[PDB]
């Protein structure tokens, strides 16, 4: 693979906290969005060069957010943009038909109390799930643009919410070392995962505020079968690790892949399913996903227990966010040092798509 570190400042040297690739794009050239402490969300044009090197072309800047922006996401259709900042509001940008392209605010999802950390989307395109420092997860209807569901069972800061692609359950992790999984239809908590036993004492699955990063973004499988949760600790002293759960039972992980030293913080799965080249889940397809820890990026697939790729020693500060591309050719990583990096793969390097 190739890794290119952007040596130029994206947000006036301020740390970058969020990225997303335009899932609505179906070609080879990609569009990216970066969120920074400059109270701006910048949309860039990312394309591989003739030599195979990623090239970033600035397109537009969004300064509507009053304060620093933490999480920015796109809809599955790629036409609806959700931006979250330190103003405890969500801005909805649509196509408006120094900037090269025009972006316009359509909806203002007011109803957050504290800093927003993670924004989640729905497959149908009509539902929001958002997490904030308000110790609450809020679920919204796009067609109305207004709050419809509230989950206030978290006792500390929530740093991640994920929606099941099949559309049945939602997983939220907060700073209280509790993993709360709710049934969307019942609008009540269904599963609680906080303590786990090894060998016969039970200790906390997660670890408290010593993180220097601001995100614990756990992920659902694009098929929804598996839940991947970072920022876990296993007492073998304690070592950092990421746990894998299945839909069959959400309370206990059989397997965890560790990152001794620095703790994993962000996880993201590719939207492209590959043919098969220990296995967590056994179906004739496979999915490739990646985790950004404090100072490294790990790249696993469905079958291999050990990482398929390991990239280390790139950024000078804690990595903030990782985001996969539409076709899988790009992987954008941002740290809190004010600069970002890109992982580019050649054609079908991860595998043969389905």
């Amino acid at each position: 693979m190739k890794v290119i570190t952007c040596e130029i400042a994206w947000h006036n040297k301020e740390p970058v906290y969020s990225l997303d690739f335009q899932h609505g794009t179906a070609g080879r050239i990609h569009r990216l969005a970066s969120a920074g402490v400059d109270t701006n969300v910048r949309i860039w044009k990312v394309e591989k060069g003739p030599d195979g090197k990623a090239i970033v072309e600035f397109l537009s800047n969004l300064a509507r957010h009053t304060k620093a922006v933490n999480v920015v996401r796109f809809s599955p259709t790629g036409e609806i943009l959700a931006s979250g900042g330190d103003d405890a509001v969500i801005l909805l940008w649509k196509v408006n038909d120094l900037n090269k392209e025009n972006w316009t605010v359509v909806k203002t999802l007011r109803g957050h109390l504290e800093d927003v950390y993670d924004i989640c989307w729905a497959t149908d395109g009509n539902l929001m799930a958002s997490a904030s420092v308000d110790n609450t997860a809020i679920i919204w209807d796009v067609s109305k643009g207004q709050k419809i569901s509230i989950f206030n069972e978290h006792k500390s800061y929530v740093q991640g919410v994920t929606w099941d692609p099949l559309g049945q359950y939602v997983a939220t992790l907060s700073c209280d070392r509790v993993l709360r999984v709710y049934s969307i239809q019942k609008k009540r908590v269904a599963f609680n995962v906080s303590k786990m036993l090894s060998g016969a004492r039970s200790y906390r699955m997660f670890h408290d505020d010593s993180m220097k990063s601001f995100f614990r973004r756990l992920s659902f499988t694009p098929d929804g079968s598996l839940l991947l949760t970072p920022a876990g600790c296993v007492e073998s002293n304690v070592m950092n690790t990421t746990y894998v759960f299945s839909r069959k039972n959400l309370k206990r992980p059989i397997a965890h892949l560790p990152c001794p030293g620095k703790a994993t913080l962000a996880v993201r799965c590719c939207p492209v399913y590959f043919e098969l080249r220990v296995e967590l889940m056994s179906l004739p397809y496979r999915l490739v996903f990646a985790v950004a820890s404090e100072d490294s990026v790990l790249l696993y697939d469905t079958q291999q227990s050990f990482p398929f790729g390991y990239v280390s020693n790139i950024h000078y500060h804690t990595l903030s966010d990782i985001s996969w591309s539409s076709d899988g050719a790009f992987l954008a990583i941002s740290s809190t040092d004010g600069y970002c990096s890109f992982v580019t793969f050649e054609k079908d390097e991860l595998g043969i798509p389905l």
Binding site: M1, M239, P258, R277, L298, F306
Partner: peptide
């Protein structure tokens, strides 16, 4: 020069850990 690790299905030195 920066160090990259690509797609392999030197990598053997970076195994993730379980706990028994």
């Amino acid at each position: 020069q920066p160090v990259k690790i690509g797609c392999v299905w030197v990598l053997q030195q970076f195994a993730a850990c379980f706990l028994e």
